[PDB]
Design an enzyme around this catalytic site. Structure first.
Site, PDB file in Angstrom:
ATOM      1  N   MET A  15       0.803  -1.225   0.000  1.00  0.00           N
ATOM      2  CA  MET A  15       0.000   0.000   0.000  1.00  0.00           C
ATOM      3  C   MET A  15       0.840   1.281   0.000  1.00  0.00           C
ATOM      4  SD  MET A  15      -3.193  -0.755   2.572  1.00  0.00           S
ATOM      5  CE  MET A  15      -2.129  -0.791   4.015  1.00  0.00           C
ATOM      6  N   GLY A  16       2.119   1.162   0.338  1.00  0.00           N
ATOM      7  CA  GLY A  16       2.991   2.324   0.429  1.00  0.00           C
ATOM      8  C   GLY A  16       3.317   2.727   1.860  1.00  0.00           C
ATOM      9  N   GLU A  22      11.106  -2.389   8.797  1.00  0.00           N
ATOM     10  CA  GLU A  22      10.847  -3.785   8.499  1.00  0.00           C
ATOM     11  C   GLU A  22      12.149  -4.588   8.667  1.00  0.00           C
ATOM     12  OE1 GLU A  22      10.455  -5.072   4.149  1.00  0.00           O
ATOM     13  OE2 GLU A  22       8.371  -4.892   4.817  1.00  0.00           O
ATOM     14  N   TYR A  68       5.887 -17.960   0.230  1.00  0.00           N
ATOM     15  CA  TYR A  68       5.209 -17.871  -1.058  1.00  0.00           C
ATOM     16  C   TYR A  68       5.365 -19.133  -1.902  1.00  0.00           C
ATOM     17  CZ  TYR A  68       3.588 -13.186  -0.127  1.00  0.00           C
ATOM     18  OH  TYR A  68       2.917 -12.105   0.401  1.00  0.00           O
ATOM     19  N   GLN A  95       6.028 -18.183  10.415  1.00  0.00           N
ATOM     20  CA  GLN A  95       5.405 -17.097  11.164  1.00  0.00           C
ATOM     21  C   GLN A  95       6.129 -16.821  12.487  1.00  0.00           C
ATOM     22  OE1 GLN A  95       3.593 -15.383   8.517  1.00  0.00           O
ATOM     23  NE2 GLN A  95       3.261 -14.622  10.604  1.00  0.00           N
TER      24      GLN A  95
HETATM   25  C1  LIG Z   1       4.597  -9.405   8.726  1.00  0.00           C
HETATM   26  C2  LIG Z   1       4.406 -10.468   7.705  1.00  0.00           C
HETATM   27  C3  LIG Z   1       4.484 -10.273   6.355  1.00  0.00           C
HETATM   28  C4  LIG Z   1       4.773  -8.942   5.766  1.00  0.00           C
HETATM   29  C5  LIG Z   1       5.388  -8.636   4.623  1.00  0.00           C
HETATM   30  C6  LIG Z   1       5.954  -7.262   4.453  1.00  0.00           C
HETATM   31  O1  LIG Z   1       4.952  -6.307   4.436  1.00  0.00           O
HETATM   32  C7  LIG Z   1       5.920  -9.646   3.620  1.00  0.00           C
HETATM   33  O2  LIG Z   1       4.869 -10.369   3.072  1.00  0.00           O
HETATM   34  N1  LIG Z   1       4.277 -11.377   5.522  1.00  0.00           N
HETATM   35  C8  LIG Z   1       3.994 -12.666   6.012  1.00  0.00           C
HETATM   36  O3  LIG Z   1       3.792 -13.603   5.216  1.00  0.00           O
HETATM   37  N2  LIG Z   1       3.912 -12.850   7.377  1.00  0.00           N
HETATM   38  C9  LIG Z   1       4.117 -11.779   8.262  1.00  0.00           C
HETATM   39  O4  LIG Z   1       4.022 -12.063   9.470  1.00  0.00           O
END
Ligand SMILES: Cc1c(C=C(CO)CO)[nH]c(=O)[nH]c1=O
Ligand SMILES: Cc1c(C=C(CO)CO)[nH]c(=O)[nH]c1=O
Lengths: 314, 309
Positions: A15-16, A38, A56, A80
């Site tokens: 989103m920015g 981050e 992914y 996670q």
């Molecule tokens: C914080 C977080 C993310 C966030 C991002 C960056 O915005 C990468 O997908 N992505 C994910 O898959 N799990 C998470 O806990």
């Protein structure tokens, strides 16, 4: 005591958020505002290897049917944990420095790229909707959300789905997954509604039966079916008698406790980067400051953020 | 406001912990003492399917070379999440009811294990077994809930041979008798006891950290020694800050715990008596509301009924 303003910029990726934050930070004197970015270096190298890519790739193989739901879930749950570690330690070390809610300008503003709930609630909830995490594991993460410190200001983002898709379809290890985009947008929308529901006096146990078949800081009380509570009427969590097992009900009690004291604001990202910056700046006027607990708390906090930024930022 | 005594019965499994506690629960009134038992139904059914089986099968397959260390680690990490969930929810719902330190208590609440069993001790043992990364261990550590007043933890003492004998006679469902795991978990718990003592006598891990490469225990005899793991260190040998902060958390959580050692090298009735003896030195707290006491009772019996065997 000198005062502190803590602002967590959160919401779906793409989103920015990061750009808007940096622009805000650029407005201030060197040491009256600090950014906790981050922790991409933790995610990519320090905590494990290419965690985003792992996430992914695991979803893709699940979607292609190359692996089972069980295999996907153990990977997502483990990833996670890694994703959330920097948020959790930061919160834990910050905690003893935060006093009660306190107005004159803060001696220090701390802006964060995301709150612990991103990794301990929001992304897990979305992976659950994607079929790659069990709802029991989501509720285990919820049970582990740290106590919500005073003056927890969270900024969530609004952006039309079409603009969001476009912005994503341009600008890691990420893959262009529109189903995930929809899931995480839904989850953050439910999140905003959940906070407002709780602050309007909503009792999930009282309204649980109303389940069967966004904004905070404003508006009427949402229906429970438009809050995070709706995600947990899953057959895995229900006793033969149809009720939630108590262990899961207690996790929802924890969810309610953690979210209800947060101060939520919505930022409209459907504008230029400088536009988002000034919108965010105006938004801070209504945000809650706190005292710190010691004189040396301010420089300590400052050192912690810069150390973090240096070690784990890109 | 009335007073509460919380007692966490912990330590390596297979020492006779469960038998000892149930005997003790049967000596005091039905409602001046409550037992929060092992959440075996959560582990076997509610949270996931046969988590114990999963854990031991994964380690076995690792030991046989059937799966990689990386594969084993993701499984162990996910499983530990499932394992600790009942402890973590319980702590979180109990926490607002706990007041400051505080004459017999209105209520004695005895738990089968503290959250650190699943958020520190078993993860660290699996690290020692090559089936968990030290980064994941420190992530679990970062999530250990703040240590509330009156956190009384009872750990076990038992010679290794006697421990092997007991363990062999009470395997859990899906469990495999693994002497390497027994040694790892025994070592972790021994290091834990030492760590609390080290911290309570004013030991500073940052000040003593250099000693790992070059009156209280030596730091090489505490849990801090485990985190000299190369995965946690920069090219120049320095601990990354993010891991050093997790150790600061570990130090803070552990130093305010009150540790008591229970000699299990005796009869079940003896073990029970020894546990009752240990109570005189335990720390009591007040609760926060007039309703706290019955709410706690209700929580404990509900837990038991739903998640105990
Ligand atoms: C914080 C977080 C993310 C966030 C991002 C960056 O915005 C990468 O997908 N992505 C994910 O898959 N799990 C998470 O806990
Ligand atoms: C607490 C705990 C155990 C302990 C028991 C027996 O007390 C069940 O294996 N076992 C395990 O593998 N992980 C854990 O977190």
């Amino acid at each position: 005591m000198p005062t502190l303003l803590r602002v967590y910029i959160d919401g779906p990726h793409g989103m920015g958020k990061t750009t808007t934050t940096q622009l805000l930070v650029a407005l201030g004197s060197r040491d009256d505002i600090v950014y906790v970015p981050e922790p991409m270096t933790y995610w990519r190298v320090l905590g494990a290897s290419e965690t985003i890519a792992n996430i992914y790739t695991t979803q893709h193989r699940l979607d292609q049917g190359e692996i089972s739901a069980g295999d996907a879930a153990v990977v997502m749950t483990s990833a996670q944990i890694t994703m959330g570690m920097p948020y959790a330690v930061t919160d834990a070390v910050l905690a003893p420095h935060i006093g009660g809610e306190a107005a004159p300008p803060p001696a220090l503003t701390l802006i964060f790229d995301r709150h612990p709930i991103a990794a301990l609630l929001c992304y897990p909830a979305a992976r659950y909707l994607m079929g790659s995490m069990t709802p029991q594991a989501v509720l285990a993460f919820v049970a582990l959300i740290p106590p919500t410190l005073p003056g927890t200001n969270i900024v969530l983002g609004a952006l039309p789905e079409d603009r969001h898709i476009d912005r994503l379809a341009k600008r890691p290890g990420e893959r262009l997954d529109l189903a995930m985009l929809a899931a995480i947008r839904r989850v953050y929308g439910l999140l905003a509604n959940t906070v407002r529901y709780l602050q309007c006096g909503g009792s999930w146990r009282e309204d649980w039966g109303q389940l069967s078949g966004p904004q905070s800081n404003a508006g009427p009380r949402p229906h429970i079916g438009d809050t995070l509570f709706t995600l947990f009427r899953a057959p895995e969590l229900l006793a033969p008698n149809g009720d939630l097992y108590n262990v899961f009900a207690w996790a929802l009690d924890v969810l309610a406790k953690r979210l209800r004291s947060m101060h939520v604001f919505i930022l409209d990202y459907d504008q230029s980067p400088a536009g988002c910056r000034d919108a965010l700046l105006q938004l801070t006027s209504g945000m809650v400051q706190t005292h710190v607990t010691t004189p040396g708390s301010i420089p300590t906090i400052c050192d912690l953020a810069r150390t973090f930024a240096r070690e784990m930022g890109e």
